Amino acid sequence: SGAIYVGNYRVVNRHLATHNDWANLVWEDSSRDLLVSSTTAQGCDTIARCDCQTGVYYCSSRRKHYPVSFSKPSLIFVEASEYYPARYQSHLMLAVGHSEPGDCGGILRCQHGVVGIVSTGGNGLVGFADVRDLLWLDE
């Protein structure tokens, strides 16, 4: 679990969005596993606007942060799950690091701000949904 809170927006994994997220929907994209809902309170987070390929993510299944080298946002095949059919997920970045399904929502950060959230993983990999291209999150 986990979310990004920036301005009057809450960014979560689309497959973990709540009834309240859908009732306050701003934007969603199944191909990216992202959903953004509106909030009444002002957020605590800053979004990175950069091309970093190194950063630190929070892993809830270890209660620890780990440093990672990650690939640029890309289209990657993701096997079927209870949430989605087998499909290509776009704007996904892969790295070597521990992750389990409940780690989705953990934040990846570089020195500039939030980069993205855990969205895929397994077998010693961890995949992050990028949010740095969503310029409207700042306005």
Ligand X SMILES: NC(=O)[C@H]1CCCN(C(=O)[C@H]2CCSc3ccccc32)C1
Residues that bind ligand X (CB under 6 A): 15, 33, 78, 81, 83-84, 89, 99-101, 103-104, 118-122
Interaction partner, residue 56 (Zn ion, ligand X, none; CB < 5-8 Å by kind): none
Q: HEC string of the chain?
A: CCCEEECCEEEEEHHHCCHHHHHCEEEEEHHHCEEEEECCCCCCCCECCCCCCEEEEEECCCCEEEEEEECCCEEEEECCCCCCCCEEEEEEEEEECCCCHHHCCCEEEECCEEEEEEEEEECCEEEEEECCCCHHHHC
Among 52, 56, 76, 78, binds Zn ion (CB under 5 A): 52
Q: Which residue number, 15 or 112, has a Cβ lying nearer to ligand X?
A: 15
Does 44 qualify as catalytic in the annotation? no
Span from 16-24, 88-96, 108-116, 124-132 in contact with Zn ion (CB under 5 A): 108-116
